Structures are given as C-alpha cells and as structure tokens.
Design an enzyme around this catalytic site. Structure first.
Site, PDB file in Angstrom:
ATOM      1  N   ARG B  55      -4.156  -5.869   1.323  1.00  0.00           N
ATOM      2  CA  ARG B  55      -3.049  -6.105   0.415  1.00  0.00           C
ATOM      3  C   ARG B  55      -1.771  -5.683   1.126  1.00  0.00           C
ATOM      4  O   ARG B  55      -1.635  -4.508   1.495  1.00  0.00           O
ATOM      5  CB  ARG B  55      -3.293  -5.277  -0.834  1.00  0.00           C
ATOM      6  CG  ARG B  55      -2.553  -5.772  -2.047  1.00  0.00           C
ATOM      7  CD  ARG B  55      -2.847  -4.808  -3.203  1.00  0.00           C
ATOM      8  NE  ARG B  55      -1.932  -5.011  -4.323  1.00  0.00           N
ATOM      9  CZ  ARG B  55      -1.091  -4.054  -4.744  1.00  0.00           C
ATOM     10  NH1 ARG B  55      -1.037  -2.854  -4.173  1.00  0.00           N
ATOM     11  NH2 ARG B  55      -0.279  -4.266  -5.783  1.00  0.00           N
ATOM     12  N   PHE B  60       7.500  -3.333   0.459  1.00  0.00           N
ATOM     13  CA  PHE B  60       6.898  -2.320  -0.364  1.00  0.00           C
ATOM     14  C   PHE B  60       5.913  -1.532   0.472  1.00  0.00           C
ATOM     15  O   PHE B  60       6.256  -0.392   0.821  1.00  0.00           O
ATOM     16  CB  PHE B  60       6.216  -2.990  -1.558  1.00  0.00           C
ATOM     17  CG  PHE B  60       5.449  -2.042  -2.482  1.00  0.00           C
ATOM     18  CD1 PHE B  60       5.795  -0.684  -2.620  1.00  0.00           C
ATOM     19  CD2 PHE B  60       4.354  -2.563  -3.187  1.00  0.00           C
ATOM     20  CE1 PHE B  60       5.042   0.152  -3.457  1.00  0.00           C
ATOM     21  CE2 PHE B  60       3.620  -1.712  -4.008  1.00  0.00           C
ATOM     22  CZ  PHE B  60       3.960  -0.366  -4.143  1.00  0.00           C
ATOM     23  N   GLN B  63      -1.579  -1.880   2.334  1.00  0.00           N
ATOM     24  CA  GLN B  63      -2.770  -1.180   1.852  1.00  0.00           C
ATOM     25  C   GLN B  63      -4.089  -1.477   2.599  1.00  0.00           C
ATOM     26  O   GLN B  63      -4.488  -2.647   2.749  1.00  0.00           O
ATOM     27  CB  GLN B  63      -3.019  -1.521   0.384  1.00  0.00           C
ATOM     28  CG  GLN B  63      -4.048  -0.649  -0.293  1.00  0.00           C
ATOM     29  CD  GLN B  63      -4.185  -0.990  -1.755  1.00  0.00           C
ATOM     30  OE1 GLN B  63      -3.280  -1.594  -2.321  1.00  0.00           O
ATOM     31  NE2 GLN B  63      -5.263  -0.659  -2.448  1.00  0.00           N
ATOM     32  N   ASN B 102      -5.432   5.073  -5.294  1.00  0.00           N
ATOM     33  CA  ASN B 102      -6.444   5.654  -6.184  1.00  0.00           C
ATOM     34  C   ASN B 102      -6.632   4.821  -7.422  1.00  0.00           C
ATOM     35  O   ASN B 102      -5.979   3.791  -7.579  1.00  0.00           O
ATOM     36  CB  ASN B 102      -6.075   7.054  -6.629  1.00  0.00           C
ATOM     37  CG  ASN B 102      -4.718   7.226  -7.298  1.00  0.00           C
ATOM     38  OD1 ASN B 102      -3.908   8.050  -6.871  1.00  0.00           O
ATOM     39  ND2 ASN B 102      -4.341   6.495  -8.323  1.00  0.00           N
ATOM     40  N   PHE B 113      -2.136   3.640   1.863  1.00  0.00           N
ATOM     41  CA  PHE B 113      -1.069   2.698   2.123  1.00  0.00           C
ATOM     42  C   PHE B 113       0.024   3.307   2.973  1.00  0.00           C
ATOM     43  O   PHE B 113       0.247   4.526   2.983  1.00  0.00           O
ATOM     44  CB  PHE B 113      -0.465   2.227   0.857  1.00  0.00           C
ATOM     45  CG  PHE B 113       0.159   3.207  -0.107  1.00  0.00           C
ATOM     46  CD1 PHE B 113      -0.661   3.997  -0.950  1.00  0.00           C
ATOM     47  CD2 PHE B 113       1.562   3.266  -0.193  1.00  0.00           C
ATOM     48  CE1 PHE B 113      -0.059   4.817  -1.910  1.00  0.00           C
ATOM     49  CE2 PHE B 113       2.143   4.089  -1.154  1.00  0.00           C
ATOM     50  CZ  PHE B 113       1.341   4.871  -2.005  1.00  0.00           C
ATOM     51  N   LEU B 122       6.260   6.428  -7.068  1.00  0.00           N
ATOM     52  CA  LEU B 122       4.878   6.812  -6.854  1.00  0.00           C
ATOM     53  C   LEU B 122       4.748   8.317  -6.731  1.00  0.00           C
ATOM     54  O   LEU B 122       3.610   8.798  -6.630  1.00  0.00           O
ATOM     55  CB  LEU B 122       4.345   6.080  -5.586  1.00  0.00           C
ATOM     56  CG  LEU B 122       4.383   4.552  -5.744  1.00  0.00           C
ATOM     57  CD1 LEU B 122       3.742   3.877  -4.580  1.00  0.00           C
ATOM     58  CD2 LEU B 122       3.653   4.148  -7.013  1.00  0.00           C
ATOM     59  N   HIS B 126       0.555   9.739  -6.294  1.00  0.00           N
ATOM     60  CA  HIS B 126      -0.196   9.385  -5.102  1.00  0.00           C
ATOM     61  C   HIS B 126       0.076  10.488  -4.109  1.00  0.00           C
ATOM     62  O   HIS B 126       1.253  10.843  -3.959  1.00  0.00           O
ATOM     63  CB  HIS B 126       0.285   8.059  -4.548  1.00  0.00           C
ATOM     64  CG  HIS B 126      -0.169   6.931  -5.413  1.00  0.00           C
ATOM     65  ND1 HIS B 126      -1.274   6.226  -5.252  1.00  0.00           N
ATOM     66  CD2 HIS B 126       0.441   6.496  -6.566  1.00  0.00           C
ATOM     67  CE1 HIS B 126      -1.375   5.376  -6.255  1.00  0.00           C
ATOM     68  NE2 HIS B 126      -0.339   5.544  -7.046  1.00  0.00           N
TER      69      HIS B 126
END
Lengths: 11, 165
Positions: B55, B60, B63, B102, B113, B122, B126
């Site tokens: 991903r 951004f 991942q 997660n 990521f 985040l 995270h």
C-alpha cells in the site's frame, strides 16, 4: 482518508 | 549502547532500485525496535526478505511488512502474533519517520509504514520507532508507483535486508 490499518483499511 | 542500523534493498518488478538505511530507536522503544531488527535479519526463521510494499499513497506513506499474507491481513511479531503499544514518546514529525501499522490498541505485529510527510493525526495512535537514515531518495522514487487508493502499479519488493550495525 489517510489512515494506516492492518485488515479493515479506512477512507 | 548504539542504535541498530538496518537496511532494505528495494526492487521494482525484480529490478533493483537501491538501498534505504534506517536508524531504530532501541533507546526509546527497545521492544518495537528489536522486533523490526530481528525480522530484518530473518534470525527467528521468518522475516521481511522477499516481502512487498502492499500500500503506497504519494504524499502520505509507504506500508509493508505483511510477510505471511502479503495484502495487509497477516504478519506476526517475534513475540507471538501481536504485542503491546510500547509507548508514544515520538511523533510523526515529517518525511522519513518509521512507524507501526496496527488494527487498534496493542495489536502490533510486523506491518510498518514509512512517512513521506508530517502526519500529526497519527500521534498517540501508532508507535514511531525509527527513521530513514540514508536513501530517502529511494523512498521518493517508490512513491511514484503508488496511488491515491494505495494500489501500486509495480511490485515493490524488499529483495534483501539485514543489519549494518
């Protein structure tokens, strides 16, 4: 949207 | 008394792109850093080598880490399937931050990521445990195969990985 999950990915 | 440096060699459809080096903050999050380090050497019999970035969303993050199902549903830690959120001392302050993906509180496995921008929403959710030390230019080249929805146009693979120090 901009999230980082494992399994159910959200918008 | 030195933070581990780990590397990933990235390939795009089997073609080698380059090396990204990471500094792992074992002095702040020892157990999250150790999980990532041991999955990068493959010393428990399983790890990141041969797995992909499933991903990528330009601007951004990128991942990866699902070495069992390769799609966002698998992976496990060196501690069992999942482990706790160690702490949230570090924040997602800019490009190059390495953080854990997660499925909610205390569900860390192996998925991670690499941030391409400051992602302050985040924080507290995270666990940030490392940063890109060398090769941020290889992460920028990786983003070009990503899309707004995360699907990559090319297979981005960790062709080899290990520990440098």
């Amino acid at each position: 949207x901009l999230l980082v999950x494992a399994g159910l990915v959200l918008a | 008394m030195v933070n581990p440096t780990v590397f990933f060699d990235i390939a795009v459809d089997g073609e080698p792109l380059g090396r990204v080096s990471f500094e792992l903050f074992a002095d702040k999050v020892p157990k999250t850093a150790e999980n990532f380090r041991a999955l990068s050497t493959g010393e428990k019999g399983f790890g990141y080598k041969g797995s992909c970035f499933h991903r990528i969303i330009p601007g951004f993050m990128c991942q990866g880490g699902d070495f069992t199902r390769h799609n966002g549903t698998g992976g496990k830690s060196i501690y069992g399937e999942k482990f706790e959120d160690e702490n949230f001392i570090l924040k997602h302050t800019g490009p190059g931050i390495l953080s854990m993906a997660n499925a909610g509180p205390n569900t860390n496995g192996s998925q991670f990521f690499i941030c391409t921008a400051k992602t302050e929403w985040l924080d507290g959710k995270h666990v940030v445990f490392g940063k890109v030390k060398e090769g941020m230019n290889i992460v920028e080249a990786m983003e070009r195969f990503g899309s707004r929805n995360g699907k990559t146009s090319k297979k981005i693979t960790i062709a080899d990985c290990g520990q440098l120090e």
